[PDB]
Amino acid sequence: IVGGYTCGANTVPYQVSLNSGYHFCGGSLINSQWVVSAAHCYKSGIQVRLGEDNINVVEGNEQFISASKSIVHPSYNSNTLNNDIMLIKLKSAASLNSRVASISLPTSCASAGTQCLISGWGNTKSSGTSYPDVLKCLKAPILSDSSCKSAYPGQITSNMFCAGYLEGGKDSCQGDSGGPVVCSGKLQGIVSWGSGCAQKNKPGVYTKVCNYVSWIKQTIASN
Ligand SMILES: [Ca+2]
């Protein structure tokens, strides 16, 4: 997250870190057994880390649970990042508590202009590299479809939305991928892609979760 703030320990209790020996992507806990992330975050050998604040210090509220299964969307296209969504099933259910909690899936798509909370352990620099240890947060508004298409011509599908600030300076970034965009208390986006981070006229692009709720529900009913 570039231009964000330190969230505060466990104040984003559905944020998970995906670890393969190191943190490599975020995700969102949607119930005691399942995490939503980006398909471009797929790796074999994922351990889900819930209850994290500092990802480099064991502080006492973590749960570390191996994935048993990952399920990339059936139409994921890694060239365009259309359908950039994945489900990860935990080998055992998380213990839900005040610091480890699920986030609701949406019933309706979010409104352009809505300010949403984006969070992660990604790079905090637009030019250069600095990865924080503690969770960072950003409030960013959803941009109109026509602004998002103007920013990335020929690349935005109906399964993507932009959010952020066209003047630059505030964005998600590498290492935030897979994590949540929460708007009015629902998971509406997944950190997906963008040109650089926090660059003028190049806002973040997010997977539009409200288009996937029937897939998510039938997949978790079947696995
Ligand atoms: Ca920790």
What's 149-194 look like in SS3? HHHCCCCCCCCEEEECCCCCCCECCCCCCCCEEEECCEEEEEEEEC
How remote is the CA of residue 52 from the centroid of ligand 1, in Å? 5
Q: Tell me which residues are annotated as active site.
A: 40, 84, 177
Cβ–Cβ < 8 Å for 124, 1: yes
Residue extents of the structural domains in the chain: 1-12+103-210, 13-102+211-222
Which tokens go with 159? 């399964």
Method: X-ray
Q: Which residues are annotated as a binding site?
A: 52, 54, 57, 62, 171-172, 174-175, 177
Name 72's bridge partners.
Answer: 86
How remote is the CA of residue 81 from the centroid of ligand 1, in Å? 30
Measured between alpha carbons, how far is 170 from 173 in angstroms, rounded to an integer?
A: 10
Q: What is the resolution of this structure in A?
A: 1.1
How remote is the CA of residue 26 from the centroid of ligand 1, in Å? 14
Nearest Cα neighbor of 12 from 167, 208, 181, 218 is 181
How remote is the CA of residue 206 from the centroid of ligand 1, in Å? 26
Cβ–Cβ < 8 Å for 168, 212: no
213: which residues sit within 8 A by CB, 6+ positions away?
105, 106, 107
Q: Which residues are annotated as a binding site for Ca(2+)?
A: 52, 54, 57, 62
Tell how far CA 171 is from the center of its chain.
13
Tell me the C-alpha to C-alpha distance, in Å, between residue 105 and each of 155, 208, 221: 26, 11, 15
Compute φ and ψ for 64, nearest 5 degrees.
Answer: -110, 120
How remote is the CA of residue 50 from the centroid of ligand 1, in Å? 9
Q: Which residues are annotated as a binding site for substrate?
A: 171-172, 174-175, 177
Classify domain 13-102+211-222 at the CATH topology level: Thrombin, subunit H (2.40.10)
Write down the residue that tokens 């950039």 correspond to: 84
How many CB atoms lie under 10 A from the CB of residue 144? 12
Tell how far CA 175 is from the center of its chain.
10
Q: Is the dihedral of CA 139, 192, 168, 3 positive or negative?
A: positive
Cβ–Cβ < 8 Å for 198, 126: yes
Compute φ and ψ for 58, nearest 5 degrees.
Answer: -80, 110
